[PDB]
RNA sequence: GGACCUGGCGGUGCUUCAUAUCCCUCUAGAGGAGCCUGUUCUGUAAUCGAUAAACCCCGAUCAACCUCACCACCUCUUGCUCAGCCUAUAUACCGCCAUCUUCAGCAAACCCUGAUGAAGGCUACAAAGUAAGCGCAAGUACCCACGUAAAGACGUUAGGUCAAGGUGUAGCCCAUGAGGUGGCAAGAAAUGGGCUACAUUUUCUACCCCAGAAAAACGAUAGCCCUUAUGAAACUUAAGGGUCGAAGGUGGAUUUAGC
């Protein structure tokens, strides 16, 4: 019974400037946990489908960086400990989405980005020919 | 430095040398806790933090940050030293056992009641 | 014999938590990392800064909560947000716990210039995974 | 900045908000040594 | 309050090198070319030699930032092998794990 | 006791209802697989040991509140094993009075079946009793009993496809060391093999590689009866030759008879060679070469 | 002194064995030469630690200055530090490890036997043992279920490290602390390990495997000279070029590694 009687909508403004057109965003998320990347992929896919954005998903091959250290302290060169870091990748390829949609979706999926997961988003931006390039000087 | 510090347990393990070549087969110092008499929020500067080391409300009003006077801090240090000395004396002294047939013999020495049985049996 | 981050069985009386009971070769297999940040990933920078900050945070929370932390801290980094999740005993009074939470959060936020938060999960006693 | 870290922790310990167990152990050892009779000689004596 | 006097010396060296980095860069750029006259290159040589010894970046040593160990320090974490092994074995370092393949 | 188990069951049911609510699923049809998927999504753990991952799921006591055990062979301490032995002996008595790809389960399987711990000699005794039961011309009532303790011990073939040109063909793939190859073999041809668009005698100047390529078709006596197009990447000349050989054999399985498929499998033309380079280990020169042992 | 109990070590045989393992057998090596590198010795005013297996391209995934802890000379005294010390002790320790381990045993807690003595507890057609736990196993990583890793207890060598760091004890405090400039590090010699070779299954060139030449030349990453790279500094580093074409001609007993 204590539901709010009336909520306030966030202020949304429409600017006369034409919106930026994005042909393709490649959200490449890197992590140490395959299950975390799978859950984040499920989240992003569901959010994009609910927002009506064309999204494909693929998995770039993982990277494993290994190094070796002396096991003992003074002298046991023959004996070593090998450590590794696994960087697993998940690429979400979103296509044909506008600038405002890209901004809101990126904010939504970056605020909910899990700890230990890094994101590298590449935005292919469609542009028209410059004014001075149509004809010579 | 600061990052070279360790925990109390590790330092005591290193200092007491409970294990090693000497202690492996028998080929004096004892652990003492430094946190039994130490209260959170007490420092050599004698500050009074509302809610941590002093009551949060005085006369029904929210206390503010206060610093004990030099004489008051001396009194607090004296009280701490007195408590430490009393605890050390209590630990050093013991309730003397009742000797058996002789002072160094084990015979006649009571061991107390046997351990209670599992199926609700007490001795 | 390997002496690194292992608890040696002597009489089956020493209680150990889940973290202590597992040797390092189990980190990827049975006990996740106590800290989670992107610094150690491929192509990411500032790994050393994150490591130093994590070490300082651990050594600072250990001394700020003397005899209260049940187990090792869990440090999470999300953007510029830092979250310290600590399992704490119920020995201390809640007033002191809240005072320490506020003090530690404010001091760490001002020291590291990031919005630090501290979540405490209270347990009646140190959880014993097994005895060694 | 080891100066910053060390001085901040020392100040917190003096204010009572940080229990430096290592420093407590070192102070206890120093007090025991002073009781035993070992002490630093005066500089430039 | 650094770990040892060696770390203090390295900190002094790093600060002095950062202070004199631009002057060293300009003078060395004057030196490292075959365009300017040789006499100007010689006076640049004596100028760069006149700079304090501890300002040379080659004297900077990558010591461990927690134990001042001069050797066996991983550049990514700036830690000695022993301290890095300790932190990784306790699991306090994200991602790093024992390698088995 | 059973009270604790029942309390846990009720708690699991309540938690299952909450999980179904959280995931938006129907609480009625919210099965165990749905529970596992929801838990994996909500608590994503990448620990390799699956037993250490988070899990939401549903031994007992052998006497009631009065202290009377339920099983008449409880005081043996191995009531399950001895009850099983008693039943088997009774079946053997009944049989005596009235008158392959299966093996016996291992001791671990028997212990799992009987939720007890058994020694090697007990397992051998039970196995010998079961063998005596089998050799006693046991009927179906005892053959099913035997099959309770029995444990079971062919290559799939790709189908023929058709291309734009109208030819009938099959396609397969194989790998060897670090080389991967994909082969397409047409039902009708003239022995032409083209690797990466290059004729095989030009892409494989080494005679050994050409012999390896010839081996599959020659084994089934089909030299010159097919045309092959192969795309291979990685590895060296011999690894590529082996990968192409395996892919060609796998694809040609779609055109030879089942008997020829079995013959090729027995000839090793279909098994993928698991021999790959072994990693070098620290403290030694190579994979197995230790350093010179000083004295 | 009597009788027992637990005892072991013995270059003491016999029968089985070892699976890259004890020998032979298999392959490629080391032990012959040069060079590189570590060690020992010599020497220096000029570190230390490592020292049969389990040291010897070891701490160092690294020393021109710094590093550096060494030496010489000079300088400073509450000193970057609510000082400092790479000063003594690994035979005070933590910490991290070697080693048997290329092992499977270690075991608390109970129960029983010997008249309730030091002790002992084995029988499967079973006759007092059960055992939590630890380890093995299992599980996991990598490419499988295989294999390799990882793992590998308790004990053993008073095993290594106070010079990663911390710390007990003891010592220095106008110096055993701190700072600056300069400097070693060579060869009579032995030794370990590595590289290049002593060639014709080779060398040079093209090619990356259907060739043409070379063939007493083969053979230095060494020596000398020069240039370049890095650097403030190259005589001491590396790369390249020129020059030189040496020892060496498949190497003794012995010895390493591989399923
Ligand atoms: Mg007496
Ligand atoms: Mg010398």
CSV table of C-alpha atoms (C1' of nucleotides) in Angstrom, one decimal, chain G:
chain,number,residue,atom,x,y,z
G,1,G,C1',73.1,-61.7,39.6
G,2,G,C1',68.2,-64.6,37.4
G,3,A,C1',64.4,-64.7,33.6
G,4,C,C1',62.2,-61.9,29.9
G,5,C,C1',60.8,-57.4,26.4
G,6,U,C1',61.9,-54.2,22.5
G,7,G,C1',66.4,-54.2,19.6
G,8,G,C1',69.2,-53.0,15.6
G,9,C,C1',72.7,-51.7,12.2
G,10,G,C1',76.6,-57.4,9.4
G,11,G,C1',82.0,-54.9,2.0
G,12,U,C1',76.9,-62.3,5.1
G,13,G,C1',74.5,-65.5,0.9
G,14,C,C1',70.1,-67.4,-1.9
G,15,U,C1',65.7,-66.6,-4.9
G,16,U,C1',63.1,-62.7,-7.2
G,17,C,C1',63.6,-57.9,-8.9
G,18,A,C1',64.8,-52.4,-10.9
G,19,U,C1',62.6,-50.4,-17.4
G,20,A,C1',66.1,-44.7,-19.1
G,21,U,C1',67.4,-48.4,-14.7
G,22,C,C1',71.9,-51.8,-11.2
G,23,C,C1',75.0,-54.0,-15.6
G,24,C,C1',75.2,-55.1,-20.7
G,25,U,C1',72.5,-53.9,-25.0
G,26,C,C1',70.2,-48.3,-28.1
G,27,U,C1',71.1,-43.1,-29.5
G,28,A,C1',73.5,-38.5,-28.7
G,29,G,C1',77.0,-36.6,-25.6
G,30,A,C1',81.0,-35.1,-21.7
G,31,G,C1',86.4,-36.8,-20.6
G,32,G,C1',91.0,-34.5,-26.8
G,33,A,C1',91.1,-28.6,-29.1
G,34,G,C1',89.5,-23.5,-29.1
G,35,C,C1',86.1,-20.2,-27.0
G,36,C,C1',82.4,-18.9,-23.4
G,37,U,C1',81.1,-19.3,-18.1
G,38,G,C1',81.2,-20.7,-12.9
G,39,U,C1',84.5,-22.4,-9.1
G,40,U,C1',89.4,-23.3,-6.6
G,41,C,C1',94.2,-21.5,-6.3
G,42,U,C1',97.8,-17.3,-7.3
G,43,G,C1',97.8,-12.1,-6.9
G,44,U,C1',95.4,-7.4,-5.4
G,45,A,C1',94.3,-2.4,-0.8
G,46,A,C1',89.8,-4.5,-2.8
G,47,U,C1',82.9,-8.2,-0.9
G,48,C,C1',79.9,-12.1,1.0
G,49,G,C1',77.0,-16.4,0.5
G,50,A,C1',77.0,-21.7,-2.2
G,51,U,C1',80.9,-26.2,-1.3
G,52,A,C1',79.5,-35.1,-2.5
G,53,A,C1',74.9,-36.9,-4.0
G,54,A,C1',71.5,-32.1,-2.6
G,55,C,C1',77.8,-26.4,-4.9
G,56,C,C1',80.0,-25.1,-9.3
G,57,C,C1',75.7,-19.9,-16.6
G,58,C,C1',74.5,-21.1,-8.0
G,59,G,C1',71.8,-16.2,-5.2
G,60,A,C1',72.0,-13.0,-10.6
G,61,U,C1',64.9,-13.7,-15.5
G,62,C,C1',72.7,-10.8,-14.8
G,63,A,C1',78.4,-6.3,-11.9
G,64,A,C1',81.4,-0.2,-17.1
G,65,C,C1',79.3,4.3,-13.1
G,66,C,C1',74.9,3.0,-10.0
G,67,U,C1',74.4,-2.0,-8.9
G,68,C,C1',77.6,-2.6,-4.0
G,69,A,C1',77.3,-5.0,0.6
G,70,C,C1',84.6,-4.4,-1.1
G,71,C,C1',89.2,-1.2,-0.9
G,72,A,C1',91.9,3.5,-0.6
G,73,C,C1',91.1,8.7,0.5
G,74,C,C1',88.0,12.6,2.1
G,75,U,C1',83.5,14.3,4.6
G,76,C,C1',78.9,14.1,8.3
G,77,U,C1',77.0,13.3,13.7
G,78,U,C1',69.8,13.0,17.1
G,79,G,C1',71.7,11.5,11.3
G,80,C,C1',65.4,10.1,5.0
G,81,U,C1',63.2,7.3,9.9
G,82,C,C1',60.1,8.6,17.7
G,83,A,C1',67.8,6.9,14.3
G,84,G,C1',70.8,3.5,12.0
G,85,C,C1',74.1,-1.3,11.2
G,86,C,C1',74.8,-6.1,4.5
G,87,U,C1',77.8,-6.1,12.7
G,88,A,C1',78.1,-11.9,15.3
G,89,U,C1',74.9,-16.2,15.6
G,90,A,C1',70.7,-20.5,10.0
G,91,U,C1',73.7,-24.3,16.4
G,92,A,C1',67.7,-19.0,18.5
G,93,C,C1',63.8,-18.6,14.3
G,94,C,C1',59.9,-17.0,11.1
G,95,G,C1',59.9,-16.9,6.0
G,96,C,C1',61.2,-19.9,1.3
G,97,C,C1',63.3,-24.5,0.1
G,98,A,C1',67.0,-28.9,-0.9
G,99,U,C1',67.2,-34.1,0.1
G,100,C,C1',65.4,-39.6,0.3
G,101,U,C1',60.3,-38.4,-2.6
G,102,U,C1',61.5,-41.6,-9.6
G,103,C,C1',58.8,-42.7,-1.6
G,104,A,C1',53.3,-44.7,1.0
G,105,G,C1',53.4,-44.4,4.8
G,106,C,C1',52.5,-41.0,9.1
G,107,A,C1',48.7,-41.2,12.5
G,108,A,C1',45.6,-38.9,16.9
G,109,A,C1',41.3,-41.2,19.3
G,110,C,C1',39.4,-45.8,21.0
G,111,C,C1',39.1,-51.5,21.8
G,112,C,C1',41.3,-56.1,23.0
G,113,U,C1',45.5,-59.6,24.7
G,114,G,C1',49.5,-60.7,28.1
G,115,A,C1',47.0,-62.5,35.7
G,116,U,C1',46.0,-55.1,33.7
G,117,G,C1',54.9,-56.5,33.5
G,118,A,C1',58.9,-53.8,29.5
G,119,A,C1',54.9,-55.2,25.3
G,120,G,C1',51.3,-57.4,21.4
G,121,G,C1',47.0,-57.1,18.2
G,122,C,C1',48.4,-61.6,11.5
G,123,U,C1',44.9,-65.7,9.2
G,124,A,C1',39.1,-64.0,3.7
G,125,C,C1',36.5,-71.5,3.9
G,126,A,C1',39.3,-65.3,8.4
G,127,A,C1',41.2,-66.4,14.8
G,128,A,C1',40.7,-58.4,17.7
G,129,G,C1',41.1,-54.9,15.8
G,130,U,C1',38.6,-50.1,14.3
G,131,A,C1',40.2,-45.9,12.8
G,132,A,C1',38.9,-39.7,12.1
G,133,G,C1',42.6,-37.0,9.9
G,134,C,C1',47.2,-36.3,6.7
G,135,G,C1',49.7,-38.1,2.3
G,136,C,C1',49.1,-41.3,-1.9
G,137,A,C1',44.8,-41.9,-4.5
G,138,A,C1',40.9,-39.0,-6.4
G,139,G,C1',39.7,-34.4,-8.5
G,140,U,C1',41.9,-30.2,-11.5
G,141,A,C1',45.2,-27.6,-15.4
G,142,C,C1',47.2,-28.6,-20.5
G,143,C,C1',45.2,-31.9,-26.1
G,144,C,C1',41.3,-37.5,-23.9
G,145,A,C1',40.0,-41.5,-20.1
G,146,C,C1',46.6,-41.3,-21.8
G,147,G,C1',50.7,-38.5,-20.8
G,148,U,C1',53.1,-34.2,-18.7
G,149,A,C1',52.7,-30.9,-15.0
G,150,A,C1',51.0,-29.8,-10.4
G,151,A,C1',50.9,-32.5,-6.1
G,152,G,C1',54.0,-35.4,-2.8
G,153,A,C1',52.6,-36.5,4.6
G,154,C,C1',55.5,-37.6,9.0
G,155,G,C1',60.3,-38.0,9.4
G,156,U,C1',66.3,-37.5,7.6
G,157,U,C1',70.8,-34.6,7.0
G,158,A,C1',71.7,-29.3,14.3
G,159,G,C1',70.9,-29.5,5.3
G,160,G,C1',70.9,-23.8,2.7
G,161,U,C1',69.6,-18.8,3.4
G,162,C,C1',70.4,-13.3,9.7
G,163,A,C1',73.1,-10.6,2.3
G,164,A,C1',64.8,-10.9,0.2
G,165,G,C1',62.5,-9.2,4.4
G,166,G,C1',61.1,-9.7,9.7
G,167,U,C1',62.8,-11.2,14.4
G,168,G,C1',65.4,-13.6,19.4
G,169,U,C1',70.2,-13.0,21.7
G,170,A,C1',75.0,-10.2,21.7
G,171,G,C1',77.8,-5.9,19.9
G,172,C,C1',79.1,-0.7,17.4
G,173,C,C1',76.7,4.8,18.4
G,174,C,C1',82.6,10.9,16.5
G,175,A,C1',81.0,4.7,13.7
G,176,U,C1',81.0,-1.9,12.8
G,177,G,C1',76.4,4.2,11.0
G,178,A,C1',75.8,7.9,6.7
G,179,G,C1',77.9,10.5,2.1
G,180,G,C1',81.2,11.7,-2.0
G,181,U,C1',85.4,10.7,-5.5
G,182,G,C1',88.6,6.9,-7.4
G,183,G,C1',89.7,1.6,-7.9
G,184,C,C1',89.9,-4.3,-8.5
G,185,A,C1',87.9,-8.4,-11.7
G,186,A,C1',94.8,-10.8,-13.6
G,187,G,C1',96.8,-15.6,-14.9
G,188,A,C1',101.3,-20.2,-13.5
G,189,A,C1',97.4,-23.3,-12.8
G,190,A,C1',93.4,-27.0,-12.0
G,191,U,C1',88.0,-28.0,-12.3
G,192,G,C1',82.8,-28.0,-13.6
G,193,G,C1',79.2,-26.8,-17.3
G,194,G,C1',78.0,-24.6,-22.2
G,195,C,C1',78.8,-23.1,-27.3
G,196,U,C1',81.4,-23.9,-32.1
G,197,A,C1',83.8,-27.6,-34.6
G,198,C,C1',87.1,-31.4,-36.2
G,199,A,C1',83.4,-31.9,-42.5
G,200,U,C1',81.5,-35.2,-47.7
G,201,U,C1',74.7,-37.4,-44.2
G,202,U,C1',79.9,-31.9,-45.4
G,203,U,C1',80.9,-26.3,-47.1
G,204,C,C1',79.1,-21.9,-50.5
G,205,U,C1',75.0,-20.0,-53.3
G,206,A,C1',69.9,-20.1,-55.1
G,207,C,C1',65.8,-22.4,-53.2
G,208,C,C1',63.2,-23.8,-48.8
G,209,C,C1',64.1,-30.0,-50.5
G,210,C,C1',64.6,-32.9,-58.6
G,211,A,C1',70.2,-27.4,-58.7
G,212,G,C1',75.3,-25.5,-59.6
G,213,A,C1',79.9,-25.2,-57.5
G,214,A,C1',83.6,-26.2,-53.3
G,215,A,C1',86.3,-30.2,-51.3
G,216,A,C1',93.5,-29.9,-47.5
G,217,A,C1',89.8,-27.0,-47.8
G,218,C,C1',86.8,-27.7,-43.2
G,219,G,C1',87.4,-24.8,-38.5
G,220,A,C1',87.2,-18.7,-33.8
G,221,U,C1',81.4,-15.7,-31.4
G,222,A,C1',89.3,-15.9,-30.4
G,223,G,C1',93.3,-11.9,-31.5
G,224,C,C1',94.2,-7.0,-33.9
G,225,C,C1',91.9,-2.6,-36.5
G,226,C,C1',87.5,0.2,-37.7
G,227,U,C1',82.5,1.6,-37.5
G,228,U,C1',77.7,1.6,-35.3
G,229,A,C1',74.0,0.9,-31.2
G,230,U,C1',73.2,2.2,-25.8
G,231,G,C1',75.0,5.6,-22.4
G,232,A,C1',77.1,11.6,-19.3
G,233,A,C1',81.1,8.2,-19.6
G,234,A,C1',82.7,1.9,-24.2
G,235,C,C1',89.6,1.0,-22.6
G,236,U,C1',86.3,-2.7,-20.0
G,237,U,C1',79.2,-4.1,-23.2
G,238,A,C1',76.7,-5.5,-27.6
G,239,A,C1',76.1,-5.5,-33.1
G,240,G,C1',78.5,-5.2,-37.8
G,241,G,C1',82.8,-4.9,-41.1
G,242,G,C1',87.8,-5.6,-42.3
G,243,U,C1',92.0,-8.5,-41.2
G,244,C,C1',94.1,-12.9,-39.3
G,245,G,C1',92.8,-18.9,-40.9
G,246,A,C1',95.4,-20.8,-35.5
G,247,A,C1',94.4,-25.3,-32.1
G,248,G,C1',92.0,-29.1,-33.9
G,249,G,C1',91.4,-34.4,-37.6
G,250,U,C1',85.9,-38.0,-33.5
G,251,G,C1',89.1,-37.9,-28.1
G,252,G,C1',91.9,-42.9,-22.2
G,253,A,C1',90.0,-44.9,-17.7
G,254,U,C1',85.6,-42.9,-16.7
G,255,U,C1',80.9,-40.5,-17.2
G,256,U,C1',75.8,-37.8,-18.5
G,257,A,C1',70.8,-38.0,-20.5
G,258,G,C1',66.8,-40.2,-23.0
G,259,C,C1',61.1,-45.3,-23.5
